[PDB]
Ligand binder design. Structure first.
Ligand SMILES: CNc1ncnc2c1ncn2C
Length: 164
């Protein structure tokens, strides 16, 4: 079913994550963490305080797909055991030093061809696949985008609901 998923997405905020490589999304799925540039770090920390759920929706650049979506379970935190991110050019380890814990809600992919009917009012009504890393996605668009993903039957949202 989809009722707990809908409950998690109730009045959530949604942010588009654009990764320059597959390796870091695979690491994020394995280790339950994400890091972003300081300008986005600040926005996510603020939104983590503001809403029942903050949802990250991941797309690897040039893949033509989303790779899944996850819910922030913490604010960012610096200085722990370093995450072995593959660093994009011009991106240093210090720039990505803030670590967010995340709980994955869906690790299945969705091709851009299936979201062509969803546009994001916070990005000039462009198709929701279009956007820079950290672009916020409006509530209705974000909800519908998440509901388009194939079910991930490996996930139990019972614990995530307890964190809300
Ligand atoms: C682990 N964070 C990241 N990895 C790869 N690329 C990124 C990232 N953040 C923003 N961009 C463009």
């Amino acid at each position: 079913g989809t009722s707990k998923l809908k409950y998690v997405l109730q009045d959530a905020r949604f942010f588009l994550i654009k990764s320059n490589n597959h390796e870091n999304v695979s690491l994020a799925k394995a280790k339950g963490v994400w890091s972003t540039l300081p300008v986005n770090e600040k926005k996510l920390n603020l939104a983590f305080r503001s809403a029942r759920s903050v949802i990250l929706i991941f797309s690897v650049r040039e893949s033509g797909k989303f790779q899944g979506f996850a819910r922030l379970s913490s604010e960012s935190h610096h200085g722990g055991s370093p995450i072995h991110w593959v660093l994009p050019a011009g991106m240093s380890a210090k720039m990505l030093g803030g670590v967010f814990k995340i709980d994955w809600i869906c690790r299945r992919e969705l091709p851009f061809t299936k979201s062509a009917h969803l546009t994001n009012p916070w990005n000039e009504h462009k198709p929701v696949k279009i956007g820079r890393d950290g672009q916020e996605i409006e509530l209705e668009c974000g909800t519908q985008l998440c509901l388009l993903f194939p079910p991930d039957e490996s996930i139990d949202l019972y614990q995530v609901i307890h964190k809300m």
